[PDB]
Symmetry: D2
Subunit: 253 residues, 4 copies
């Protein structure tokens, strides 16, 4: 069922994953040489063995795989932040999303997945090299069909109209507030990710100026604690990622 | 555009949301009486008035309104927990999900909206009053098309096959592990939400025993702090919801 | 034995405490009337019974009982914040402490307990009613031996010299930095408690300006989670106190 | 004023501290030889110079210095946890404390500082090399007067009686419960520090068997978030110490 050119997740015995394109070349590993040609005509769930006899399993790549293994220009918007943006903004299949700060394309890949083949994500970017690398990430993930990158400064305006969500992770989201109020559907969401307290203060004040266009804003911070579970001791993992950014939501009119 | 029988969200000046089916009747509010018939023939983004001069904005119902306004039992799975289920398990449009513990239909509604018209959710439930209640909400939210509620003890087995995700909020997820291993696609996710660390210990024991059926399980705990942001003062809100439940993820072999 | 005028802690069957003054007057309770005079001749570890038959145990009042049961114009600086102030700044028996913001006298009580009968806490306060209130609180607790309340505005200066610590919980702690710099012993701690980010920002501004007077400042934030532990279920408590204030520490060169 | 044999902290133009016993010798350091003969007869707040020009400040050793610079091999109980133990148990000058797990002496130092010259700390230990290292640390910090270490297993029993607090950092505190019930004064505190949920569950089980000797227990967990305050950005430190141990408190009768 797998043909040349298709993408595949190879899982080694230790649980390490390789998101691979099937082709006539021999992939090198910790644990021997895979001949990726042997994968043609196999099914997901079958295995291939390296030259030293270690078994690698073939999985269909999912969004988590693409997200986990893309070329990143550190940092990004993290899974957990993307998650709450989706939840509290209620992003849905079919939604039309404008986003600014395409970066590596991480938030874009996640949002593209949520809106499906019939949703649209339009990403703004001002940095040429980030646009060229994001686009390569989005083609690689197959979202080629639903995402458009505009090499354009969103501060100067939003061309689009009747958008479901404006989602931002750039330095000054306050400079987009006025444009978002025009672009957004009634009941549409303005969403911003900001690492600093200062950015929140500014944004909240701008959103107060635009009380007539937005509902009362909401700013959250998400923490995720991994648990270390064993036979005897169950306890939280000693260190954790405590802070990425704040997320501010505001409903339109 | 708005016709009889459609569902609409009315927003009052304060920002109180009313989820209403538009029909020929009068609706009684703390800001006076409304005639829903005046909504008919109008478009989203427009306003109707009350017999005290107070305006009511008309918005298209989004998933977040349904989750906010549905009938409930006591405990539920909160948006943040479902958010991370979605993010960490890679729940995508078109997915086939098995969930047990429908309860009030909160989680099921969340997942139904993520999977889209072409995804499917099958929910098991042992408690006949909950099943009726949950089904009441999904027809109401319009996910009629994609959701099926089984009145069946999931511990007896999972009749579905090639499922993308098995997602549990029930007292003993360990008693579903063997079943889910057979039901899940290669690469699919077992996901369990458990309030106590006892549950997690027991569940981790079962997954340990099924080592050759799942990758290394990870267990997480998610906290969300709201921020009180004023002109003079930005502090985290004094009080917060600090624990709902632990979430455990395991990918199938 | 216990005599008239002694202060005592009555613990009821449900574990509830009552800090009481022993005297010929009968005290009214959920569980019946207590003849407090019957607590004369009795000793710590003994009990007395209400007219409804219920037994109240007699304990020696400790610092936690005074802190837990005093008259507040709430909220105070919470015992979690005061603990970390003590621990991080090294507050020891015999210390000479200047604090400003006597308020209810809660912080003052805590530090007074720490410094001991031979230590000194000098508390500044600009409000006559608070000063009366707190002084009544500290008498009540037996600390009038070691605490001084100066009805004076600390922004105008600190009369004391060679102080161990300057501990602040007032709105503009930056206006005390210079005075604290000159009041503190070498190795003495400037400590401020500030509910808002904004206050931390200004206080960091001022401490940068006086870098030649202070080591690098450190701002913490402390959360305490309660656990629900029962035979079956052990989980963190659902709701917690998430924020009181930030605490900044600065060592004098 | 400062004579031979006394202890002194040296602060350099970076901020780093060195705690030494003052005696005539060319002290080897990163910024050049010190020669601690220029220091004798000086006062605190003065400066002494090396051969490379730079200046070193003389500070009086506080409890924070001893806890920083001590030989601290084995994992300590953390300052934040010591703090809440002090706070919630109401540990006061002059208290009599039995503690088990002397470890390196860290928790023993901190407690010995709080109970003061007239308090007593009896530390139990079963490991020789730990006991030798612990006694060598407390003598160095000057608490020889108030601390005794017993090379004896606390599970076998508690020799002392009428004690203020039993403070534990060992693997099975539930075995010390009955002994503590005998040793503690009316209103005294049993305090145990456990890194695992399991340990807490066992302990709570024992404490409830001893409901007639103890008030309902209270288990807590403390987190400290460091704040990053730069001129143009305030945010929490990205990473933070999230879990060290749970702490359980119970009042005797
Ligand atoms: N006005 C604008 N329009 C479109 N993209 C923008 C933009 N301003 C910035 N960007 C892009 O948005 C991305 C994130 S900017 C980096 C944000 C950083 N975490 C912070 O602390 O603020 C970058 O790729 C940047 O080039
Ligand atoms: N074996 C089973 N099959 C299907 N549904 C079940 C089930 N056991 C419980 N449920 C349903 O799942 C929902 C949540 S059960 C309550 C969960 C609890 N907090 C715990 O984990 O301990 C209820 O609606 C209940 O009827
Ligand atoms: N310059 C100053 N000198 C002395 N006390 C001051 C002061 N500024 C404020 N205070 C006192 O410090 C205390 C804390 S004020 C900050 C907390 C807040 N205003 C509240 O009341 O909850 C108050 O009792 C106030 O009267
Ligand atoms: N019954 C007992 N009496 C006295 N000390 C004990 C004891 N059981 C354990 N200890 C000591 O208590 C301390 C903490 S024990 C828990 C930490 C971990 N097991 C470790 O050693 O790294 C150790 O110093 C240990 O030697």
């Amino acid at each position: 069922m797998i043909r040349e050119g298709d993408k595949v997740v190879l899982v080694d015995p230790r649980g390490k994953r390789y998101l691979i394109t099937v082709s006539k070349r021999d992939f090198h590993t910790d644990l021997g040489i895979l001949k990726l040609e042997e994968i043609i005509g196999r099914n997901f769930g079958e295995a291939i063995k390296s030259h030293k006899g270690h078994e690698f399993k073939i999985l269909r790549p999912r969004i988590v795989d693409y997200l986990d293994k893309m070329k990143r220009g550190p940092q990004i918007v993290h899974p957990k932040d993307a998650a709450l943006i989706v939840a509290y903004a209620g992003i849905s299949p079919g939604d039309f999303i404008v986003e600014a700060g395409v970066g590596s394309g991480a938030l874009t890949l996640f949002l593209a997945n949520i809106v499906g083949p019939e949703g649209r994500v339009v990403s703004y970017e001002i940095r040429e090299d980030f646009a060229k690398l994001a686009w390569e990430n989005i083609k690689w993930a197959g979202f080629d069909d639903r995402v458009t990158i505009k090499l354009k400064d969103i501060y100067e305006g939003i061309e689009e109209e009747n958008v479901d969500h404006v989602i931002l992770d750039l330095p000054q989201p306050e400079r987009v507030v006025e444009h978002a109020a025009k672009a957004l559907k009634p009941g549409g969401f303005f969403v911003a990710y900001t690492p600093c307290s200062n950015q929140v203060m500014r944004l909240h004040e701008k959103l107060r100026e635009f009380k007539d266009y937005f509902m009362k804003p909401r700013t959250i911070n998400v923490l995720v604690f991994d648990q270390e579970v064993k036979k005897e001791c169950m306890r939280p993992r000693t260190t954790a990622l405590v802070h990425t950014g704040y997320i501010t939501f505001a409903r339109r009119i």
